[PDB]
Each structure stands twice: as structure tokens, then as C-alpha cells.
Amino acid sequence: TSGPRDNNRNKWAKKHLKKGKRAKNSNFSKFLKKK
Amino acid sequence: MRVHTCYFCSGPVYPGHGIMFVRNDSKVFRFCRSKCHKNFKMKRNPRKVAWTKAYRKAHGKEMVYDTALAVTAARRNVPVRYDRNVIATTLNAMKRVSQVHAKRERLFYKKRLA
Amino acid sequence: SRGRGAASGTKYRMTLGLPVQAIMNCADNSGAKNLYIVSVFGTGARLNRLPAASCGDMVLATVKKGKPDLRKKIMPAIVVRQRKAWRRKDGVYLYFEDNAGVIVNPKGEMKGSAITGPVAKECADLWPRIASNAGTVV
Amino acid sequence: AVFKNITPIPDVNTFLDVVLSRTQRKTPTVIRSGFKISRIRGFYGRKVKFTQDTITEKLDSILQEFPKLNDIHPFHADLLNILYDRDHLKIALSQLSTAKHLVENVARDYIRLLKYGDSLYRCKQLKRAALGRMATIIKRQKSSLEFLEQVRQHLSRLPAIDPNTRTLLVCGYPNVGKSSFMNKVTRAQVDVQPYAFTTKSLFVGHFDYKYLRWQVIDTPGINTIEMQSITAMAHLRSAVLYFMDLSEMCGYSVAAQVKLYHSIKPLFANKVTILVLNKIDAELLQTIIDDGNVKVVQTSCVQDIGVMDVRTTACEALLAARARPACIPDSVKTRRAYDANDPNRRILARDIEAANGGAGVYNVELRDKYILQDPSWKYDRMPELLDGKNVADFVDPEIEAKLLALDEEEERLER
Amino acid sequence: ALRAQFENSNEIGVFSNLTNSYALVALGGSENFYSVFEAELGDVVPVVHTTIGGTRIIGRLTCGNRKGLLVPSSTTDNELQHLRNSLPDPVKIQRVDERLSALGNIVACNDYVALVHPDIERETEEIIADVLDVEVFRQTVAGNVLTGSYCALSNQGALVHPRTSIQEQDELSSLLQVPLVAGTINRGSDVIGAGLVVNDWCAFAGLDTTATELAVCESIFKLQD
Amino acid sequence: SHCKFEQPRHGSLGFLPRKRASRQRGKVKAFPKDDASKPVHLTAFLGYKAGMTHIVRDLDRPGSKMHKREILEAVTVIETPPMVVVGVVGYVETPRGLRSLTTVWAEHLSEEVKRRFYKNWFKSKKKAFTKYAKKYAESTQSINRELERIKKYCSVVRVLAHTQIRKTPLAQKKAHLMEIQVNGGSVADKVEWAREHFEKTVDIKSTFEQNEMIDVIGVTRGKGNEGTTARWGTKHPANVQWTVARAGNAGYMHRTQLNSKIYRIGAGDDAKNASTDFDATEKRITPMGGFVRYGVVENDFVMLNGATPGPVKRVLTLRKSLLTHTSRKALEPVSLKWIDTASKFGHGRFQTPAEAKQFLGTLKK
Amino acid sequence: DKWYKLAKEQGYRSRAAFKLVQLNQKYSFLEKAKVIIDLCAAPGGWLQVASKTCKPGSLIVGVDLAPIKPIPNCHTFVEDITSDKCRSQLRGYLKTWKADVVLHDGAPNVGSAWLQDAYGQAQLVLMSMKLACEFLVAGGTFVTKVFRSRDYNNLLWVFKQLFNKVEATKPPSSRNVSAEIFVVCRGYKAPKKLDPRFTDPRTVFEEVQEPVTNVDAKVFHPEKRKRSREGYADDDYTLHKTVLASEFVTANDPIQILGTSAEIVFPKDDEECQRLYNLDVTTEEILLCCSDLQVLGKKEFRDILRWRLKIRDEMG
RNA sequence: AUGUGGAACGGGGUAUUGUAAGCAGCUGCUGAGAUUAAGCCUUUGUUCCCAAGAUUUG
RNA sequence: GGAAGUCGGCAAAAUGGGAAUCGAUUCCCACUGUCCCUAUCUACUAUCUAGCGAAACCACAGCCUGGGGAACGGGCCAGGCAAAAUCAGCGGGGUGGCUUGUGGCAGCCAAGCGCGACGUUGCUGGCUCUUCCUAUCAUACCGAAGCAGAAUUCGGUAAGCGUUGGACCCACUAAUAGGGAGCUGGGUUCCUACUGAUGAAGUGUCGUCGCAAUGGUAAUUCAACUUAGUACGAGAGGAACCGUUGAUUCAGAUCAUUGGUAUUUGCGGCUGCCUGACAAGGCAAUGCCGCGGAGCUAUCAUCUGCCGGAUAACGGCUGAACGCCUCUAAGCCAGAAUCCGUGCCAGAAAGCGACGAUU
């Protein structure tokens, strides 16, 4: 099985970070940031 | 999520605490701590071990019955449909058990003192 | 393919208490009495580590005492009971008072028909056939 | 008999290169003259032995994967007869086995002489003398290895037959509608072309009917193809499906087809033939009809009419030769079956899933379907424990009444 | 008669239980199984995505009919509360303090008659008759004690082992007042209960069930109309 | 000659030297990457390991073997009283690294942070920051100049914050002072945020929010000098190389546990912090009889999954994860069902004395 | 080893050849054996010794699965050791004669459970004597190798009924570290017909049940978990077996009942058990003790035993 | 280096064991008694002690 | 769990014993830290201190790499390097640029200079251990093949990471690939290194908070759910990518729960001993037994193990050389578990910055 150094695994991990899967962290940061 | 009752001391058994033992007759025993588990291994009768609630209630050292509030507790094998009004006033009945049982707990020991 | 053959679900890590050379009770009505552990499936490359099995693991078993025609096959066996205490993922610690197992084919349906004694739910979940033919599942 | 599992045979050069490369790569390579003579002898002995082991390992793989013509069902044995000349195939396989034994003999001989090697050189040439003889042995079966590879390639193409199961052999004149009948009956995509004898070899196709599966084997029309067709019906518990061109639109005369069927009747015996009138839409036949076993079913090949009836008749002939009130809900009587394409079809949790992230991401709400006096509380958390007691032991629809009765009682005790 | 697979397993009786008033499916795996059940019974009876004791063998752990449902001792309070909330009011649920926890293996019960493991407890038999409202009979199937796993029951038909004799066939039919056929499910597997779940108007079997077997179940269960 | 029977290396070469950490406080060797798209927010906090317990939570993990079941997990309780911001440090990027250009301190420094500057507070004349306080009172235009310098030249803004160790039931009186990098916004925005946060307390309620994934860093427990057996896991003419396992220090090393989940951030002023929606039963996070060797938790606390490095009453640093990692374990919510507060000093059997008193009879005392 | 060196020097193909010749020297059987059939002939050392020692022109047969190197006067049969075809060739070569001595050298592959290997050839020797007793003449001899195990006594028992004399021994060339024994079964009984009990191995290796288990020791010592690995009471579906109270009182095996039964019940339906229930001698402590037999101590068992004796005094 | 100061004891809580001696009449006092930080928690409790000696430092 | 350890029941536990063969061997039962797999407890030593106080050994000493014809060595050559004084451990240090994958005899050619190359034809030692190499068994990615699918064969880059448990045998495993540079059996009759621990010293002094040159580096494999009974296939059979869940091995932590440990000698019980007696306690080289907090600990318990560039095999774009073509010559794109960083550990005790006070 491909490891974590895999360039593919890095690529779709980047794809996850490119979409709303990290938008739950943006608004999460904004909540404390505003309060 | 059930706070079971130990087989040996008859005390509460919370999650994580204690041991579960399954016998070949599919009977399940729950032990709250290592003291009760090892005592069960040596097969010491709870009715003849002093520090057990089973001994205390079977030796006259604890109340014969407490029909507190016309109903105190049972192992209900028929589930009941969830209601708020039922769930809130039974939350209150919980407490009303506690003071009444606490009151009778004071009265019984005061009687046993003399 | 025997390794996780017809498991219908992953197993959680469980305390290992039945290594190889273990002698353990047959639990089915097929006629076998005692089993001897020869090897366990799914053991990797660990130096000096003795291969071991838990509840619901599939092992290679030899019927030491039992019916002669039941013997002379290194038959797959499912460990259904274990004396060593193990942590169920919900938190409770469990241990049956004897080490028991069933004679099964590599596919995952046993030669027996009814299980005498308690059956671990981990065993009954990785092996629906044992669950189907179990009498009491705990 | 799935002949596809035979490993591919390298030509003599690649075989030698693979063997020698494996010997070089897997065995140690460096030795010095100053080493103890025992280590020198062991060094070259390993290479000779390792090369022997690689060669037999490959040669045995061939000898085991090929089917033993004697031990197999005589349908396939005779089919391999007409296609491959069992004697040539048997000679080719025996040559490899004789080679295998020769490779073993040379290696045993040279390992034996190596025990007496006195210098790094005299061992070096026994090893060179060894491997060369091993190689020259292999180079002599160039024809046998090439022949077996060709046989292998065509073997992997043959259909997987099973005479044990119920069958219905279809044979007749070339392009006489038998291919059309096979295509209409079975899912097999048999090519139909104006060129005669388009079906060079046999074509096996399964068909489900009468709660059973029958393997219809279409044979070449009637040469090597004709011989293979004859052997196909030679050993098979099946019925003949002869198709005679009623209108002669297939290019074959009806009288000629009848004469051919009468001549082939000796091999078609013990079977329920069919007197198919092919190309119905597009005298001599009296003698064929006099047999009785042949079923005269019209086959309008141009209009594709009667093919299903003929197939059903043939299948039937082959089979012959071989208080509890169930209160079903009213909605069940008018329930529309869930078929995806229709718009009236309701939704399923499977479709909610693909919309809401698919497998592993969508969290199914277990609580979403509770029969409950409200849809809002539908996500509430019911208290389970309170002050050492479960809330569950006390959930009673009249529990308020027990509490008021009680009130009165405590008010009595305080007084 | 339909063909379905839970995950990639031919045993759907183990992972689901079906009655004439409700359906129960395993939780936590693929809901494709729940999706298939809803496709045929969603508009007829409720389908409950439930587990019993944090376990997916609910089919062989719980036995029930169109009237009542039974759960073993290992059933958690939360799951029991979940089942009560999901199922409609006219259906009653009961915990059983039975040594033989596998209710689905020891009890094979239709709407009117149930045949039980021979060594069942008297208190279990009494509460079964009270809740299920069926006549209970202690007998073995083909000399085999697991009646629920080795026999499938419906209102109009039932199946048993092919190993049973003709006189055992007649006796079982006479004691059950329902047509009974000796057969097999999932291509030669003699666990009829594990491979088949049947209500009074539809049948589910594993995808590996042969066409001949499906015809047999359809013939005995009269489901063509 | 080759090794006959091979095994993987008995140790890890990435954690040596196995020497004693040159620090007692967990160092942040990496702060999360900055971004001007997001304005101001902190990135770290400092707490004390009070003790650890176990909880029961309903696991909503789609696709899991135990989806929608009750699970038991060990949890670590770290008391996190609010920390006072007393300084700001500007860092300028140079071809030689990040260099601290200047530092600005708040006017009023508590004795808590003043004790950090002395090895003996009582003998000292307490002269630290006195002239700084004088110049702060006299002329604020000077301090405005360093802040102008920070917002004009510096690229990284960090705030010096010290923990109110007085609030914790610790025998230590020195406050732990560290730098938390202000991530987000322009350098001017960070400088302003530091200014309006001078002398005020920043709490864990504003730093972390009960669901995110953090890195917990600290110094591990000390096991003393140990032989090759327990230090390393041990069962041609040359000189001994560094790779050979040897006998030496085992324990008290700086470690970093990644991917720790906060199950709960509770408030000290609230008396329901140990109670959940499935439990009621008014109680506090402190177990019956107090935490073993720590005391009673009376301030804001954080409950992490698993175990964290170091023994009780040791200081831990909690930082935001450097890299986003959207594993569904890191993205799922947590709904606590029950928290264990029985006596950890022995085989405890009761959650609170209130509910112990009904079961037990009337004690003579 | 030394015997391997002797074999390679002299020409014999195995140390087992030296084992055979030493056995022939001490027992003096093969020299008079006109018809010798050797099963599992590999590697052929037995055949070489037999051909050399015996008078040329005898009926020497060697049957094995591997290619048997043609041994002089030894018809070599490369087939299964008990194939229908191979038995046909044995009969075809036997003709009017009958088997006099059947040599056997069954050696299955080792590398599995020791019980498997020992029991594995045990049927292979058992099967080989089946074909032997098919082919033997009256007074014949059957010689082979067996590893000792729990089935070794049973195999020798079957040998005792099927042959007049048994002379099992171990030669010096045999590796004493291993557990092999050379059994020599001479004086063939020559029965009227081969008994189905002997032929069919269900009745041969059937486990002979032993006397009652030492359960009173466990009764007297409820502690000391002794790792019970025997089985489950010969197909006992429910392990919560209960014993009638009146039956236990009237029984003559109280220790066995306590050691086997898990509970003693006092049914209300039975009038005698109800009378025992209402008896003043039966107390609540005894009632709870007998309600859970397995969780009971030495004192409780002794109290129960005294109680049953007191009831025995009362009823008669 | 006079402080929400420290220390020695004491109380309470929490734990370990199992119901003490004695008074008595197995039972009651008595889930009592004993131990409890030596690397458990707490203290409006009492008592006591510290605003000292030496050394190196531009 | 019960000899799975070892050449082997060496030694302990069963109290040593039951049956066979010749005291030995074997077998079945029995027992157990030999082992999986180590953990805990006690005493002594080692540690420090007061006093006393040696000996062996000693040309001088003390870092490594390549070379010094040899004998390479420590002194010589060329490099890496190199900062006082020390402490406790452990014992390391006291002969071809060879070689590898393709045998021997004869003839026919014949590029060419009597030979004559390739061809072509004729015949019979094992138990544990650090690191390195690739000449790759598995894992990653590619090309070819009747390669439909699945499974597979060969070949290329590739040494990052694994390559077991038992008596050549039989299992597991993804695989059980090949080699280089403390110990025991049958067979012949000081100093230096390594590992931890202090430590004087510029920078005025003492501190607090930091920076980061450099050195080390870590994660590995499997199967489970859909995607599927779909692509493909007459059928038999039947995958993949995205997403998700567990487990094997390894690594780093932790002690809520569970087990273990008992000098808490904490409590209780039993035997014997000690004052006339009711009692009262105390004693027995840790008298014996049960429980036993705290601590320690267990893949016997729980937790945690991540992303950016540059490439190799290889697939392409434009495009000449060579008016065509061309992945290459100038340039460009995609591309492997690979290399380099990030992250993680250490922090130059002769690298540094900011701040505080300053007798």
C-alpha cells in the first residue's frame, strides 16, 4: 500500500484542503477570532 | 449506559469500573472492584462476609422494605415511549425519592441506636 | 481467502490469550472433544513472538481427542471463548471461564450444528454462521 | 476445462537469458583466489545447482499446466486431436521432460567433479562447462517450445465446455440460419457474415429456460472445421438442431441438406433432431420426416419468426429425453415498485447518501424516523442517569399521578 | 421472492429480521440493505435501523411476529428505548431474561404458532405466549435444536432441512397447521432461517440463492399474486 | 558476513540524543503558518496537567464498526486559568533567520511574572521593571516608537503571556512566561490587538473551542538512568558507533503528541462542568477526594483524548495544529454522555458524596 | 550418522535398511519368507536387503508412490499403496501363492502437530494391514514401523486379535531419539472372514470412555482452577443442568451430583419437593446455597451434605 | 527577609482492611476499630519559626 | 498459554509418577517465568562521604577516511576536523583493477589480414547482534505478452520499508531475496571510542524570553464497506480510482480503567512463644495465608505517528539536426514507497538577538 510520502496521497490530501473540508476550520477560527 | 449492581457488595457499578464474568451457564456476574472479584474467586458467601450490603440486608441490619412514593424502582422490561412531561416530572420524582429515602434512613438508624 | 475469509466486518484489537501449542475445548456437536493449536491466520513477521489468537480469530486446529473421521485434517477453527480478560471497546472487561472454539471449514461455515456454552459477540459478528448456529451469544 | 491458466512460454533465447540472469542476480558473485578451496568449490557448485533448479522449475511448470490428453473428457481429447495432433503434442511434451532429466544429469555430474577442484580456474570452467551444456540442451527444443506456445495461445481462446450439463448441439449447412438461431436463443454474440463457414470453430452459449441452464454448442457448418464439428456431436449428451434452408436462401439446396443430414444420421443417433425450415420468410424431405425424431418447425429467418417456439420445443424435447388471515396492507396492493427511471418513485436512503457525501461520510440520523408527537425534539438527548438512578426505570405515562398520591402521604407524616 | 446481500454476505437472515408488521435492519454497515428493504416495504410497514447490544446479528438475536417483539438480556436500555420509539404503539416489546440469549435461533414464530428450542425455560415459554399470543410447542427440527435458524416460518408456508424424513415432514406440518417443504437456501446451505426472511406477502433471500430455490420458496409461499 | 536473522532497529534514530531536556516548559519549535487573509487570532495556550479520568461518549463515526454505540475513552484534564498578556515581541526576517528586533512590556507587571526573573524573590529588592514603569508613566511617545518600529519593520508578532499560577492549587509561585505568535492579519493589526490586550487576561474559551485538533507538547516523566533493557528495548574489529544501543538517561525528554482532540472546555465558575445532557447529577470535574497529587480544579479546564506527556502538575503547551488534516476523526463532533469523577486514590466506587450517602447507611459521624 | 556412513559405503540406500537386516537377524523371519510384499518402499533400502538375504526367485514386491528403482526380483509398482489397480497387480502377481511376510515402511511428512504425524501413519499402517490381512496366508507375518501415541496401545490391541504373536522391538540402528517402534505380527490368525469392526476404523480408534471423573476433589476444593480440557459432557446442549431435590436426597451419589449439576431445584409441582421446601430443616441459607451450586464453598457443600443426611434420617 | 509565609501536629474528606479492645446482652454499641502520605486533597484549628550567617561578583 | 526455549524439561513446580521398549529411551497424562514477555519486591555490592590505602603495566603517547609498494601504523602524505577541567557506565579498539551468463572436437563459409570473426551443421553450524551493497522476494510506479476480467509471466527505475513461527520437511505471511565488514555443540582416537552527567571562560555581571548553523530522523503492510455482482465475460467468474473503517509490524508517550507486584510489613486470620489468672498487648532471620492503597508496569492496559519541491524508469508537447520525420540537440509537461526540504529530536557548551536590573 502507498505510504504518506506518496505524491498521490499528498495530491488528494491537498484536494481535501482545497474544498469545504477546511471551511469548517475557517469559520471555526472566525468564531473565536470574533468573540 | 446502565449503572449496574455488583454481585458481591451489591454496590453501584459504573462504566469502566470492575470486571464482568460469564459462566458456562451463560450467567453474567459483575464485580465492582478487585476485592469483590477475588473474594468471588475464593467463593466467600456474601451473606457471611460482613462488609456486603447483601449480608446487611439479610441479617436485619437494613430496612425490610421501602415502598417509598408508591413505587421506588424496578427493572422494567417493557420500554415506554419518550415524553417530556413524563420525563420532567419523573426527573422530579427522582429527587423526591432521595429526600424521602434519606429521611427514612435517618429515622431507621435513630430507632436502631436505642 | 481464509485470511479474513467471509468476515463480514472488521475486528477490533483484542487481548491475545491463546498462543500456539494451546489445548482448548470443542464447542460444537460435531463430535470432537479437544483441539490443539498449530498456527493462527494473519500473523506477520515478529521475531521470537509466539503466534496467538483471540475470540473470533481463525486458527489451524488438530483434534487431539475426538471422533476419528473428524481428525486427519488440519482444520480451521474459530476461537469463540477465551479465559484471558480482554477490554471490550465499550470499556467493560470480559473473560469466559474456559477457552472454547468450533471446527469450521476455510469458507466459514462449521461442520457442527449447535454451540454448547456462551458465544462471544465478537466471534458472532465476524462469523455470521456461528451467530446463526449459536444458542447463547454474550 | 478452462485452458486459460497456462503460463506463457518464452522462446529459447529469453528462456536462457531469464535463467542465466536469475543465476547471476540471486547468487553471490565475487570470489578471490586466496580463499579456501572448500569455499571456491561451494561457490561454483551453488551456481550450477541454482541454474539446474531454475531450469527444472520452469520446465515442470510447463509439464504440469498442460492438460494430460489421456486423463481428460474424450470430447476435449478428440477436439485436441483434430486441432493439435495428440502425437505431436505428446512428443513435444515428452521432449521437454527428457530435457528436464538431462539437465538434472549434467548438473549432478558437474557438481560431482567440482568436489575435486584444485584451483579457482578449474572450478570456473566446470561451471562454464556446466552452464553451456545446460544451455545447449535447452537450445535443442526450439521447435517444441515454439509449438507449445502456439498451442497455448489457441488453447486460451477455446470456449469452456461442460458436457456434464444439459446441452443442445446445433449443426447443419454453413450459414443456414443456425448462427441466427444461436444468436437469438443465447446471449453469445456469434458473428454472421456472407462469407461461408464464418464460425471457424465451435461456439458455446448458455441459455436459461425451464428453471435450468442449457449450454447450446454451435458447430461449424457442413475439412478440419467439419472434423471438429463431427467430434463435437460424437461424445455429448445433447440433441441435434439441424437447420435446413426451406427456401434455399442460404445458398444450399434443400435436397442436398436432406442428403447430408441422412448421411450424418449415424452420428446424430440417440438424439432428438429438429427439421427446422430455415429462411421460411426468405419429396426429399419426406424421407427425413419419416424418421419422426426430427421436429418440423418453421424458421422464418428473414422475419425472425418461430425461433423462440423452436427453442422452446427443443428444450422441452431435451428435458423429456433426459385461522391464518394474511392481512396484507391496502398500500401493498397498489404499491408502485421502486424503479429508478420513473419520476413517481419515492426516494431511498441510498439516494440521500450519494447526495450527502456517499459511503463513509453521510451520517444517517437514527432518530430521524421516530414515531413521535413532534419532529423538532427529534434530536433531543434523553437523560439516562440522575443521582445514581436511571431515568429509564421511572418512565411511566401516569407517573404524575403516583407523585400526587405520594404528596398527600408525606403531608400526613409531617403532621 | 427477492435476492439481496447485506454488505457482501449471503446470510441476510442473520443481519435482519422481518415480520408482518415491521422490518429490522442492521446499523453501521451499508444502508444499501436498508435501501432495498425500503424499496419493497417502505410504504407497508416501518423499517427500523436498529442494533441489539451493539451488535448486527439482530435477526438471529430477536424473534418476533406481527404482534410483539422480543429482545435478549444483553439488550441495552438505550437500544430498547430506541426500538420502542421507532415501532408504532400497537406493537409491544419485551425483554427476556433467558439463558439462551439467541432468541432468533431458539424460537421460530409466526403470527399464530411458534416452535421453540426443547430446553427453553418455563418462564420464557410463558412470557412468549403472553407477548406473542401464539401457541408454543417444544420440538426439534431434523433432530436439530435450533428451530429459528434451521426453519423459516410464514402464515402460508414454511421450509425445513432436506435431511428431514417424510414422516417428520408430515408431523411438523400437522403440528404447525401450515404447508411445509423440505428444501435449501443459498445454493445448498441448510441454514434456512439464516438465508431466508419471509413475511406473509414477500420473501427475501441471498443473492446466491439458485433460481430453482427461489421457485420453491415462491411455490410454498404463494407470492405470485 | 551478513546478518542471519534480521529485525527492525530496537530504537528510533530521530529521537536521540536521549539527554535530559534543557527546559521544564514545553517549547514551541513550530508555529502555524501565517496568513493575512484571516485577521488576528492566537495559536497556543499554557496549562497544567491536573489528572486524567475516563468518559463515555456516543460515537457518531460513519462507516465505523461501532457507529452509534457507547464508547469508553481515557481523558486528560488540564487546568487552564486565563493568562495575562504583558508583552509583545517583534521578529524581522533576515537572511540569517528570524531575529527579535525589539520587545515592549506592559506598565503593570504582577508579582506572578516578576518572580520568574529571580531565583530568590524574598532576598531581592524587587528592582526589576521599576525604571521601565517610570518611563512608561512619564512618556508614552517612546513606547509608541517601538510599537511603530514593530509594525513598520517586523514580520512576525508574538505576545509575551504568563499563566496565573496563583489561581491553580500549585505550591509553585513563579508564573510561566512564554511567547504566543499572533497569527493572522497585517503586522499593524497584530500590534493593535496586542496593545488593547495588554494587562488583560486571555482565556482558553477564546483560544480553543472544544472540537479542534491540537498538538500538546511537554517534557516527559523522568525514569532516571536506565540500562539498555528499558532504555532501548533490547532483548568485525571496529569502534562502537552511535547506532549501537547504550545505557543512559531514560525519561525527561521534550516530546510532542500530535492530533489531540478536546472533548470539553469547561468553565471554573460553572458548577455543571462535569454534568452532561445524559447525566444531570450536579458535579464538578474534580474527582471525589480531589485529584491525586494535584488538588481541586477550580478554574477553566480542558479535557483531551488519550494521554499527554509528563506527570501531574507539570506545565503543558497546547498549540493549534500546523497543518490542516481533515480526517473524519478530526472533523466529527463530540457529545459527552458521562464523566467519571470517582476516587482515583484507590478503587473508588461513588461519583459524589451526595449520591454515596443514600446507598450507605447513616454513618455514626 | 554412523549408519548413514555405513549405508553409503556398503551400498544400502538408507539406515532403515540396516534396521531391517538387524531385525531379520534377531527374529529370523525373512529368510523363510517366499512371498514378501513391501508397502511404502521408499527409498528402497528394505527391498535391497530383502532381495539380498532371501533366496533368488521369490515373490518380491515393492509398492510406493514414488518411482521405485527396480530392485532385483522385486516387482516395482509406482502407484498408490492401496489403489484398486495396484491391488489388482498384487493379485495378478500373487496368482496361486499368498502373501507370507508384508513389510511396511510408511513415513508421512513431518512438520505438523506431533499427534497428527503419529496418528497420520497410524491409519496408514492400519490401512496397510487391511490390505495385508486381505493378502496374507495362515501363519503369515506383518512387520512395520509405528510412532508411539495414545493410539499405539489400541493398534497393538487390534494386532493381538488379528495375529497370534506380537514381538514389537526397537533395533540399535533406529534413531533412539525418535519415537519409532518396529512391530512384528507373526502367526496370522486366518479368520473365517475379516471382521467389519476391525476393518472399519470408527470402531478401531473409538475413544474408550473412562471411569467417573475425579469430581469429588473439586467439590471438596471449589478453588484450584485445573484447566478442564476434556469436552462438553458428550453433547450436552445446556450446561445449566438441574437435579431434582427429592432425587438428590434419595440418591446414593451426592458428591457426583454436586460436582456435575449446577443447581438443585425444589419444584412446586412435585409434592415431595414442596414438602422438602416446607420442611423446617431446610433453611433460607441452604435454599440460597442450593439455588447456586457452582458458587459455593467447602463449608456450604459440607452443610448441604449434612442436610441431606438429616433428611435421610427423617424419611427412614 | 512578616507573608492570601512556611513548618510540626490536630480535624475533615478520600482510601485499605473488615465490624476491634472494652462495655456488655451470635447480637447491640459496630460498615466499627486500626492505618491514611511517607511522591492523596483541604484547613477562620492550635503551637512554633523566619525582616540571618558566609562566599563570588563593574 | 504450558517446553512453543534449548542440541535437551539445564534449573524450578507438580510429591516428581503412570504405561511401554532396551538405569537409558519413548509415549500419554501432570506441573511450572525455559519461553511468548517481561514486570514487580527485598538484602548486599556498585554511588557519595570520614579514615586508611595498593598492584599489574609503563620508549613516548593517544580521533577517523584514502594512500604510504610490505606490515599497514600512531607518528609520514592529502583531507575531515580540532577549546579547559571532569563524573558515572559499558568494553569496541591492544597478498592479480582478480571476480560474474552463455561447454569440448571437426567441417562449411569468409568482413578482411595460412589464419580468419559471428554464424551454420554434425555427438555423450546455529543462538542472539550494528551497519552497508543491489546483484529486488514483497511493497510503489512503468513497458511488453491470447494481457477480455480476475489471477499471472518477463523486463525497467527503485535498497525508503519489511523479509516469521515449528519438527529439506508444514504452515503463516504481501514476502518469508542474495551477500560484505558476545556464546556453544556434535565431529577424528591505562588511553581513545560509544552512551548519558556536570563544567571555568570572553560577549561589562546576573538573569528572562528567543533565533537556528549543523547533526539525526519514521512510519510500514494488509483487508473491510460501498464504487459491485457494476466495467469485462455465452457463461464461469469479476476488478479498479475517489471517499471511509479497522488491523500487522515499528516508533514515542501515559497509568482513568483492568491485570500483576507487596516492606504501607496497612488491616485481618492461623501456629507457636512471652506476664498467676478475665483480659491486655508484644515476639517469631519478611513464621504462614487472604486482601492490599500509592508507585512501578503490561501490543496483559490506553493514546499518538505530516506535506512541499527536484528527479529516475517511462508517457508526451514544440522542434531542428537531415526542406520529411523525430520526447532532445536548445526548451517544456506529466511522472516511483526515490533524493532534498517541512514536521519531529539535539542546540555550536569558542554562533547570535531582544529585554530587565545594575552594587
Side-chain angles (χ1 to χ4, degrees), chain E residues 31-145:
Chain E
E31 54 204 359
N32 281 317
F33 198 66
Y34 176 86
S35 185
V36 174
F37 263 101
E38 183 182 359
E40 307 292 335
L41 284 89
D43 313 327
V44 175
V45 298
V47 188
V48 178
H49 204 82
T50 181
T51 46
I52 292 293
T55 308
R56 319 177 290 111
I57 48 154
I58 60 167
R60 304 271 51 61
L61 269 190
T62 65
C63 68
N65 77 333
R66 76 167 293 159
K67 314 202 151 303
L69 189 152
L70 301 185
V71 315
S73 65
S74 59
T75 325
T76 58
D77 305 331
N78 178 28
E79 278 173 342
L80 191 53
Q81 183 83 100
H82 159 59
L83 263 172
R84 180 65 268 168
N85 288 282
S86 56
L87 280 192
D89 297 332
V91 186
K92 73 221 93 64
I93 316 298
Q94 183 79 11
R95 254 168 167 168
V96 183
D97 53 356
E98 175 50 50
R99 174 161 81 280
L100 306 177
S101 72
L103 303 179
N105 298 10
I106 66 183
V107 177
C109 154
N110 54 75
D111 300 355
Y112 298 96
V113 57
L115 189 151
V116 48
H117 190 292
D119 299 333
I120 209 50
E121 303 165 357
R122 266 194 51 280
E123 170 183 10
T124 325
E125 159 185 12
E126 293 162 4
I127 66 171
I128 281 176
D130 181 78
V131 180
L132 278 297
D133 290 331
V134 299
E135 48 181 5
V136 55
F137 292 94
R138 305 166 169 258
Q139 173 144 350
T140 174
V141 164
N144 250 195
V145 300

Side-chain angles (χ1 to χ4, degrees), chain A residues 2-35:
Chain A
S2 57
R5 283 176 277 265
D6 176 357
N7 288 120
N8 281 315
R9 292 292 85 193
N10 286 313
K11 174 182 321 313
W12 331 89
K14 188 179 291 186
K15 174 252 281 183
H16 269 175
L17 305 183
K18 284 175 66 66
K19 68 167 68 177
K21 267 62 190 163
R22 174 230 51 61
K24 190 65 187 71
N25 199 309
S26 91
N27 63 6
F28 182 76
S29 164
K30 297 166 192 328
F31 277 128
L32 291 315
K33 166 179 157 178
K34 263 70 177 174
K35 182 266 289 180

